[PDB]
Design a protein around this ligand. Structure first.
Ligand SMILES: [Mg+2]
Ligand SMILES: [Mg+2]
Ligand SMILES: [Mg+2]
Ligand SMILES: [Mg+2]
Ligand SMILES: [Mg+2]
Ligand SMILES: [Mg+2]
Ligand SMILES: [Mg+2]
Ligand SMILES: [Mg+2]
Ligand SMILES: [Mg+2]
Ligand SMILES: [Mg+2]
Ligand SMILES: [Mg+2]
Ligand SMILES: [Mg+2]
Ligand SMILES: [Mg+2]
Ligand SMILES: [Mg+2]
Ligand SMILES: [Mg+2]
Ligand SMILES: [Mg+2]
Ligand SMILES: [Mg+2]
Ligand SMILES: [Mg+2]
Ligand SMILES: [Mg+2]
Ligand SMILES: [Mg+2]
Ligand SMILES: [Mg+2]
Ligand SMILES: [Mg+2]
Ligand SMILES: [Mg+2]
Ligand SMILES: [Mg+2]
Ligand SMILES: [Mg+2]
Ligand SMILES: [Mg+2]
Ligand SMILES: [Mg+2]
Ligand SMILES: [Mg+2]
Ligand SMILES: [Mg+2]
Ligand SMILES: [Mg+2]
Ligand SMILES: [Mg+2]
Ligand SMILES: [Mg+2]
Ligand SMILES: [Mg+2]
Ligand SMILES: [Mg+2]
Ligand SMILES: [Mg+2]
Ligand SMILES: [Mg+2]
Ligand SMILES: [Mg+2]
Ligand SMILES: [Mg+2]
Ligand SMILES: [Mg+2]
Ligand SMILES: [Mg+2]
Ligand SMILES: [Mg+2]
Ligand SMILES: [Mg+2]
Ligand SMILES: [Mg+2]
Ligand SMILES: [Mg+2]
Ligand SMILES: [Mg+2]
Ligand SMILES: [Mg+2]
Ligand SMILES: [Mg+2]
Ligand SMILES: [Mg+2]
Ligand SMILES: [Mg+2]
Ligand SMILES: [Mg+2]
Ligand SMILES: [Mg+2]
Ligand SMILES: [Mg+2]
Ligand SMILES: [Mg+2]
Ligand SMILES: [Mg+2]
Ligand SMILES: [Mg+2]
Ligand SMILES: [Mg+2]
Ligand SMILES: [Mg+2]
Ligand SMILES: [Mg+2]
Ligand SMILES: [Mg+2]
Ligand SMILES: [Mg+2]
Ligand SMILES: [Mg+2]
Ligand SMILES: [Mg+2]
Ligand SMILES: [Mg+2]
Ligand SMILES: [Mg+2]
Ligand SMILES: [Mg+2]
Ligand SMILES: [Mg+2]
Ligand SMILES: [Mg+2]
Ligand SMILES: [Mg+2]
Ligand SMILES: [Mg+2]
Ligand SMILES: [Mg+2]
Ligand SMILES: [Mg+2]
Ligand SMILES: [Mg+2]
Ligand SMILES: [Mg+2]
Ligand SMILES: [Mg+2]
Ligand SMILES: [Mg+2]
Ligand SMILES: [Mg+2]
Ligand SMILES: [Mg+2]
Ligand SMILES: [Mg+2]
Ligand SMILES: [Mg+2]
Ligand SMILES: [Mg+2]
Ligand SMILES: [Mg+2]
Ligand SMILES: [Mg+2]
Ligand SMILES: [Mg+2]
Ligand SMILES: [Zn+2]
Lengths: 83, 239, 52, 50
RNA sequence: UAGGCAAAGCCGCCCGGUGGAUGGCUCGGCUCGGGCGCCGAAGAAGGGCGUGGCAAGCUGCGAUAAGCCCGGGGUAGCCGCAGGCAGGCUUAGAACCCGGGAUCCCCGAAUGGGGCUUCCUGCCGGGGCCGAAUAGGCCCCGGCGCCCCGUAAGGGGCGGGAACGCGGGGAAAGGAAACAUCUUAGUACCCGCAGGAAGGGAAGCCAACAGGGACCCCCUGAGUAGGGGCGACCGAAAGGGGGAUA
RNA sequence: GUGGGCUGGAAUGCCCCGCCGUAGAGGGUGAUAGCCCCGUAGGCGAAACCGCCCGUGGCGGAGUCCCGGGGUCCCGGAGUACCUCGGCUUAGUUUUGCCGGGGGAACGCGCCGGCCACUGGCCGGCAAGGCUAAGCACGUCCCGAGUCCGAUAGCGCACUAGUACCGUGAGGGAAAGCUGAAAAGAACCCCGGAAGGGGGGUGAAAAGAGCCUGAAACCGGGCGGCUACAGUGGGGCAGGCCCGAA
RNA sequence: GUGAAGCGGGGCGAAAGCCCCGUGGAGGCCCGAAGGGGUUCUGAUGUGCAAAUCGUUCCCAUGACCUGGGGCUAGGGGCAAA
RNA sequence: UAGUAGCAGCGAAGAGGGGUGAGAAGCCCCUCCGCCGGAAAGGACCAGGGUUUCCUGGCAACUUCAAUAGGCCAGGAGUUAGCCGGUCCUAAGGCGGGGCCUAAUAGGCACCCGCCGAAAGGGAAACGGGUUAAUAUUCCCGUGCCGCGGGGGUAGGUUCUGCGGCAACGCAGGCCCCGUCCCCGACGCCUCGGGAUAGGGCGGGCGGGACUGCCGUCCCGCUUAACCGUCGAAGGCCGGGGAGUGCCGUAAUGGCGAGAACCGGCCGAAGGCGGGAAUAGCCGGGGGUUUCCCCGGUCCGCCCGACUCCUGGGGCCCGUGAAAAGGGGACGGGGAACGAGCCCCCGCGCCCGUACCGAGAACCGACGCAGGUGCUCCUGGGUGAGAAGCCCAAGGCGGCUCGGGUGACCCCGGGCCAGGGAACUCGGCAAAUUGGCCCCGUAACUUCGGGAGAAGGGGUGCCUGCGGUCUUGGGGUAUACCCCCGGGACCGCAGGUCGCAGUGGCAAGGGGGACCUGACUGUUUAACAAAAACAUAGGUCCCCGCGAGCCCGUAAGGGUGUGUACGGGGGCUGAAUCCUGGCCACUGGCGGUACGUGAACCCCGGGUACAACCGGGCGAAGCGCCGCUGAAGGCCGGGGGUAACUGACCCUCUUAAGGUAGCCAAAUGCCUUGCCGGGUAAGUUCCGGCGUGCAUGAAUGGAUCAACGAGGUCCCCACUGUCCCGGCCCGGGGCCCGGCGAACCCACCUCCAGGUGCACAGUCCUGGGACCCCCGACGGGGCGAGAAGUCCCUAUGGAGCUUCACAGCAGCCUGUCGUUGCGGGUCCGCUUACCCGCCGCAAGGCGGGGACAGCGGCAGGCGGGCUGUUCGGCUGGGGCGGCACA
């Protein structure tokens, strides 16, 4: 509780209630978005802010989806097609 | 008490131990790597003396090696007896041609590599005795040694050379490096001590010690330990 | 500082808690045995002949 | 402490239950011989080693 | 001049306050003599928590909780220390004492697994509850330690006990008028292992040409032989008399 | 014997008179009790549990038992006996026992011992496998006794003591007994905010729950002597004031 | 507060090349609160507020920095910028 | 002692009236006064405490005074969770079993297996309002969320596949089981751009409040939770385009045929807005009565803006800033005929914590203790650079738990002081001076960075106007510019004017020169030493190729080591710059042909019916001997004479050589206040020189001061109560009164002089004095008190340290016995022993070494690494000396 709030792991949000008071709500920070397995950059269509685990996310309509980006997928497909 | 610092070091205290949890793993050759591999990462390792390459073999085995100077991400390395002696390739010492600069040399096959593992270091393949399956190599110290011809080495020199030429300008820089290494930092001179704590400690005008024999027991074996000589005359006699 | 000012730091720590076997305030929470009866490191009761 | 374990809480409850002087009818029954109790204590003075 | 005549203060006696000596008392201690002598997985000892109408501690007991059942003794009182207030139990035989049973929380060798809180938690089988449900969930009960013996069934060890016993490891202080060999001392202490005792015990013995006849313990042999900076000091055995007798 | 009288709050005491005694060990009861009571000498006793002794009973074995002769064939305990080196120990000393390193037998025609070793004689035995009652140690505990202590003693603890309590912990650890025969535990009146005070009661006695006795130090008051021009305590002599009942 | 590397413009040259300004934001850098420390008065206190304190004056204050919780090292041993 | 000390000091404090009550300065209420307000003080809360919380009653005890008060006493009561924490995960690490080790265990742990390990890390899901004396994300109302499971509808499926877009990617995207892979979880520090929100303010409006000497101003309310939807800045990406006379930019670095400008599109924060939701809450106005009902309002336009939240850019690292649970996706295999991540509906969510303090009275320190823990996290307005100080909100407090009188001395803290200005003093100790900001200006020297705020000089208030540079919105053709309007910030100019004083209070550097010393920042003797001591970067030497070197363990084994010479370990020096001289005699280390010596074993001879026993031989290391080694410990004189102190001469002694470059009366020079100059009227200190230097000198570091200094020292200016020299004042002690109420010390208790005496008498002698008692003060005496003197010595007393003491034990080295076997001729070979590493759960396999090594026993050497001891006596005190020790 109190040392858990003294640590900076949660966001300190000040909010004014309908009762006229000002309170501090301790809210979670967002989880990191999925990254490409080769470049490490965030994947398009999956970089929305998520604050808890267990939320199903819809991958882009492509082979390998939210695993690799379109650049890596296209280049790998070209290499496999030639090879 | 009375036990000296070099005697206290052997107990394995936290201030003398190496924090190897800060590293991803040992930099050794796995026993049965063969074929072609891909250099996927070049990383800094805390407490080590060279950048470390992560090699992803064609069959999926991944291992850590010391990065040859000039090695780059996405490079294709060859492992095995059929590998050409190009930089980054892992070859047997028996196959490696004479005069070649190798590193991470294995004294016996399968130990993972022992010699020429610091940044900017290398071993030189001097000769090959195939009738006793041995390879004569010169180590970084200048010493000439025989190694198992079936052992493995990497072609090139270890990256990161020249790291020690730049001075450690502040005590804080050496402090931060020591925190990643195993060194106890800093060190008190022996003659700055009292007689209970060091053989050199004591007198009103404190002095160092003359050399002790090689048979001296622990706690007495400090300073020069069975030295052939000392000073500029010793260096001259060595050369 | 070793006297009264250092006495103020003994307000929140602990070395021992109550032992489940012998009930004394002698169970070392870090060493995980009782300093009185030896529970947690010896299944036989700890009692020495030099103690009255 | 705000956060307690149940065993420590139960030992504290035992101390709270025992902390009380003998009843007045017990004093009258013993003819003023039993006046005090060994389990009587003050929270600021005598400290439980719970 | 002295008395009437006295401040603060000093000495002695008496009375009072304080104090708890003295004396008297004793359900306590201590010593000695005799007996008796093991408990524990059928879960012990020890601890925590609880338990009384008013009950804090001690004592007892264990959610059936100063207590329940059975039998014998004991008859009219009883509800412990503990002299109060109530209300009860008991002549349908209580209380009390002795023998036998029932109950016997949690921790504890603790033994399903954990245990930084004497509390928490898992899997399997059976049962119960919430629920529309046969889902899901929750709760109750039982089993689940290690190492062994045994074909299996099944069984054994574990921990405790005031002292005593057996095997092992094993000091120093002090003494020697210093001190090292020595002694202290195979002691203090530590590790392990038993029993009501343990260990020992039935001649490859002792003797000396005469003969004893397993063993232990007691008296003696005896501070003798002997060991020893031959100093301090240490120190038998055979033999004899007994306890007992295999 | 609870008999007569006396003292006494109350007799077990005193004077007088009786009785038992295998019992006059000891304790209690309103003061000191052989005969008031518990007890003592002595005797009787267990549904249940436990222990010991005796008689009897059921069963199994390959004659394994006793006596006589024959034998000279077979068996008779190994890293053991023994030697050497180091060490601990022992009275064990050129000679105790053992542990470790190294070496290492024989077989009853043999092997072992008889205070250095070997040789011969003589004597005594059969190691290197296992058990064994009785007679002996101890004291948590039970019983008895005492030229033991008697609440600062005796165990640290006569008591809601291994307690309250102290230390993080290993550990350490006190102080503290007594109304009276019976609560008859102080009615009632006046005062006080109350603790409480006065009066009045109970009691043989306040012995008043702060409770037997109740010392000294200490403090208050009364009394006697001195007390502001005279330097202190102790002794002797003379005197002033005060006490001088036993 | 200072203003490192780096970067723009202006002036001056035939050039090689110098100067001025700005931008930039380095550092066991500087002044200074919190915080850490403990120099002077040899102040106060010194049967204390306290078995080491208080006032004043001071030192560091982006780092070999200060600080919470958990952990390891044990006595002839630990730990020690000593 | 003594009704005495203390109940002061650390920057708050009380007063009037009333009530209660036996009793009131102190309890309760109002009014006045004061204190905090980035906090010894307001909000939250960890550990610890454990009922101190709330209510009722009370004052025998407790609170440094009182009490009717209370954290006290007595009685009663109080802590409600699927969504807040634990619980789960792993970290550093730890424990258990198996195994190995061990005389043994309750001792050890590399191995294998399991588990524990965070109430600040990772991590499922709840918010707003109301309610109680005391719980409040827990109770109630309202509105939701998560996990697990089920039902209906639906999209979808039912051999086979979902649909659209060039694409980035979008969209309900069927069901069940299993596997694999990837990603999230998952990460430093510094810096600067952008976007928000909390909070704050300004003008107007409505409602309410404050004041009555004048004006009419001043204050308060006007709020919006979680959750659902939608939007989305930076950034990234897709399609078109095809660019070098370039073109496009930033706060800054800058970008482009390796694909720019430009056009369109995709993914995409905090947060906004709507719903929630005005029906709540709040402000105001009424009615009832036990907290309910009714009415009005809850608005308009702007501005600032975080330390809170989000986002991106750049830089630094010999420093790279955790893991796992859990979750998401994808890629495959298998199965059924059904069926969802969408909509509606149903069910379940166990166990433990939850009061209160959280500290100048609830923790620790014996205390209701000026300390420590925790100021750990948060906080409005003015001034202001400021989270500084000062004043005031919200909120709290007058309880750092004695009150009154007096206005002596004296003490603690504070203010001023004429003339002089360090004459004080060991010493400018202390105090004083300066002080902010702007402008001008700034030396020697230097490692070129610095020195530097060097130094030195000038300005500074208020008022009335005139401008400028931006910013933020709105309106104008109008995205920049331009004009108008509202708000914000900073900068400047002109004039007028007051004072002793304009950074007017608060806040707030004195400065300069020279020597020594340590380069610097940093660390140190908790409780007398902060330093020149330690460390430091830099330099250098040594042991080491890894089966190493060094170290720990009885051993199993372990650390360095998840390592590898640009490395691990061990010494010395201590930035940089110029340098680092000669010497291997000694003490060590190391290497070596031969020779002497050199233990056990072994062999030979004698002896012994056998042995004991005696003699000899062989002979390892080591020692002797011979060399190397000084950035090993370290040393560095002379004798002389000759000779123009000697430039030169021969050398010799010499423990080896004979002090080089340098530097000096030094923190090193006795003599010694050395001699010569400077400084002062006067200088034992200081500075600059001189140097046969008692007794300077080179990594034992020499010389050396740029920068730095709570270092030590000398001088100059300024300044001043340091002083001539003392005075006056302020607060608190003080004194007096009321209340509480100790301690130290105490044989008894003592007027003075001169003597005497165990030699320094209150008590003895001879004198001189004194009416007794009480108060205040002081510190001459009572050899005043505190503490069995630490100084000295003795003791056949210790401890620690040293080594060339007496002994001993580990450790290392060496020989030998055993392990040690098989061949071939003391030698060569072999592998199965044994050892070393790899794979493997194990079984076993691979490679290397190899009867060597390692290991056990014995023996020798080195061996203060470690253990035990001894270091005599006499003595004009002990010691040196001497032996008066026979
Ligand atoms: Mg957390
Ligand atoms: Mg986080
Ligand atoms: Mg370290
Ligand atoms: Mg020192
Ligand atoms: Mg030495
Ligand atoms: Mg030493
Ligand atoms: Mg020395
Ligand atoms: Mg200490
Ligand atoms: Mg601890
Ligand atoms: Mg306390
Ligand atoms: Mg008088
Ligand atoms: Mg029990
Ligand atoms: Mg268990
Ligand atoms: Mg046993
Ligand atoms: Mg003795
Ligand atoms: Mg002696
Ligand atoms: Mg002695
Ligand atoms: Mg027996
Ligand atoms: Mg026996
Ligand atoms: Mg003996
Ligand atoms: Mg009778
Ligand atoms: Mg035999
Ligand atoms: Mg008495
Ligand atoms: Mg006693
Ligand atoms: Mg009395
Ligand atoms: Mg008379
Ligand atoms: Mg700094
Ligand atoms: Mg001082
Ligand atoms: Mg002082
Ligand atoms: Mg004082
Ligand atoms: Mg500073
Ligand atoms: Mg007074
Ligand atoms: Mg006073
Ligand atoms: Mg103030
Ligand atoms: Mg104020
Ligand atoms: Mg606070
Ligand atoms: Mg209260
Ligand atoms: Mg109250
Ligand atoms: Mg209370
Ligand atoms: Mg866990
Ligand atoms: Mg509350
Ligand atoms: Mg307004
Ligand atoms: Mg900028
Ligand atoms: Mg609360
Ligand atoms: Mg106080
Ligand atoms: Mg402030
Ligand atoms: Mg207020
Ligand atoms: Mg006050
Ligand atoms: Mg006063
Ligand atoms: Mg003046
Ligand atoms: Mg002067
Ligand atoms: Mg003078
Ligand atoms: Mg000063
Ligand atoms: Mg000021
Ligand atoms: Mg320094
Ligand atoms: Mg410093
Ligand atoms: Mg100190
Ligand atoms: Mg100091
Ligand atoms: Mg130094
Ligand atoms: Mg240097
Ligand atoms: Mg040296
Ligand atoms: Mg030299
Ligand atoms: Mg010279
Ligand atoms: Mg000088
Ligand atoms: Mg000189
Ligand atoms: Mg010299
Ligand atoms: Mg020196
Ligand atoms: Mg020298
Ligand atoms: Mg130097
Ligand atoms: Mg110098
Ligand atoms: Mg005299
Ligand atoms: Mg005297
Ligand atoms: Mg003395
Ligand atoms: Mg002394
Ligand atoms: Mg001395
Ligand atoms: Mg003597
Ligand atoms: Mg010692
Ligand atoms: Mg060998
Ligand atoms: Mg050996
Ligand atoms: Mg020694
Ligand atoms: Mg001697
Ligand atoms: Mg002498
Ligand atoms: Mg002498
Ligand atoms: Zn215990």
């Amino acid at each position: 509780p109190r040392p858990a709030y003294r640590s900076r792991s949660l966001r300190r949000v000040k909010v004014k209630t309908p009762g006229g008071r000002t309170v501090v709500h301790y809210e979670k920070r967002a989880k990191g978005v999925p990254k490409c397995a080769v470049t490490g950059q965030p994947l398009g269509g999956m970089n929305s802010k998520v604050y808890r685990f267990g939320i199903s996310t819809r991958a882009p309509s492509r082979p390998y989806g939210g695993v690799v980006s379109h650049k890596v997928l296209a280049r790998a497909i070209r290499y496999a097609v030639r090879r | 008490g009375k036990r000296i610092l070099v005697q206290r070091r052997g107990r394995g205290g936290s201030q003398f131990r190496s924090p190897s949890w800060k590293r991803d793993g040992p930099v050794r050759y796995p026993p049965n790597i063969s074929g072609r591999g891909i250099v996927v990462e070049i990383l800094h390792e805390p407490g080590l003396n060279a950048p470390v390459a992560k090699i992803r073999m064609e069959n999926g085995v991944e291992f850590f090696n010391y990065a040859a100077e000039g090695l780059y991400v996405g490079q294709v390395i060859q492992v095995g007896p059929d590998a050409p002696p190009a930089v980054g390739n892992v070859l047997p010492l028996g196959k490696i041609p004479e005069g070649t600069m190798v590193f991470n040399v294995e004294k016996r096959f399968g130990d993972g590599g022992k010699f020429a593992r610091s940044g900017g270091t290398y071993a030189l393949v001097i000769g090959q005795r195939p009738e006793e399956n041995k390879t004569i190599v010169r180590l970084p110290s200048g010493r000439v040694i025989e190694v198992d011809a079936r052992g493995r080495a990497t072609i090139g020199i270890v990256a990161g050379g020249g790291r020690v030429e730049k001075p450690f300008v502040k005590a804080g820089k050496k402090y931060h490096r020591a925190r990643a290494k195993s060194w106890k930092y800093p060190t008190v001179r022996g003659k700055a001590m009292s007689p209970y704590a060091h053989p050199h400690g004591g007198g009103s005008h404190q002095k160092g010690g003359t050399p002790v024999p090689k048979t001296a027991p622990p706690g007495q074996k400090v300073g020069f330990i069975g030295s052939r000589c000392t000073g500029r005359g010793c260096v001259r006699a060595r050369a | 500082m070793k006297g009264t000012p250092s006495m103020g730091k003994h307000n929140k720590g602990k070395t021992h808690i109550r032992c489940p076997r012998c009930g004394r305030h002698s169970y070392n929470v870090t060493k995980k045995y009782c300093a009185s009866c030896g529970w947690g490191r010896s299944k036989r009761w700890r009692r020495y002949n030099w103690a009255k | 402490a705000r956060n307690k374990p149940l065993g420590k809480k139960l030992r504290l409850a035992a101390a709270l239950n025992s902390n009380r002087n003998p009843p007045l009818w017990v004093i009258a029954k013993t003819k003023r011989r039993v006046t005090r109790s060994p389990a009587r204590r003050h929270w600021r003075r005598q400290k439980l080693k719970a």
